[PDB]
Copies of this chain bind each other. A is one copy, B any other.
Amino acid sequence: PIVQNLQGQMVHQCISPRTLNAWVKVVEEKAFSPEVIPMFSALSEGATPQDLNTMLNTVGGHQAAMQMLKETINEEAAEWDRLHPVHAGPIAPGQMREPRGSDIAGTTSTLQEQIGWMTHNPPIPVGEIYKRWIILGLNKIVRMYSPTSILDIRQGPKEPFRDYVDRFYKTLRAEQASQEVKNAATETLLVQNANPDCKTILKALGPGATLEEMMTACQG
């Protein structure tokens, strides 16, 4: 990665085995649970497209997913080559070339070319652009790998309400709805899908009750 710490200077450094090992373990244990993505984002801060490839490529298993993730990266590379066509010309001595889709994705560029683009002024953040493509790819996978439809999350007859809500908002997180639409499934589905005893208690509350108020209500 590249972050500014060598005094005032901003020097490149080798991806940390601890960062790698961290990312591989999270993927092994958690299997594209939604929280994996924020973890990916946080382990890959200031990551070069090489670094990103290292993290993705050291995942053994979930290869179905990693293939899907390749397909997505290709789609976002194609769309980039359509939007930014390279005007083929000999490189002026003081400049470097414009990066193609495949160059951002780290497939056709060198670490030198990648450090070039990111540390150039104005910046060409090939790291952060490729990251954007990957994350878009993971989101699709997370939505895919979410086991149950939100419709199917129903509070059991003996199940604590706090447990039911915990599943409900977990499911929702995976089946990625914007936190406007998550806040709007609150006063609708969550109630409709509660068990009979606790549904009655939640209807009796009236509208516009907070999540605190609903969970306090069904505590028994």
A: residues with CB less than 8 A from B are: 1, 3-7, 9, 11-22, 30, 33-36, 38-39, 41-43, 45-46, 54, 57-68, 70-71, 140, 144, 162, 165-166, 168-170, 172-173, 179, 182-183, 186, 210-212, 215-216
Contacts and interface: CB of A to CB of B under 8 A. Distances in A.
Given A61-B166, A210-B71, A3 B9 contact: no
Contacts of A42: 15, 17, 20, 54, 58
A38 B55 CA distance: 9
A42 to B, nearest CB: 5
Contacts of A57: 35, 38
A215 B64 contact: yes
B15 A45 contact: yes
A166 B162 CA distance: 26
Q: Determine how many copies of this chain the complex contains.
A: 6
Given A68-B212, A210-B71, A63 B169 contact: yes
A70 B39 CA distance: 19
Given A33-B60, A63-B166, A63-B170, A46 B212 contact: no
7 contacts: A4-B12, A20-B39, A35-B59, A39-B58, A41-B54, A63-B168, A67-B182
Contact of A70 (B6, B16, B179): B179
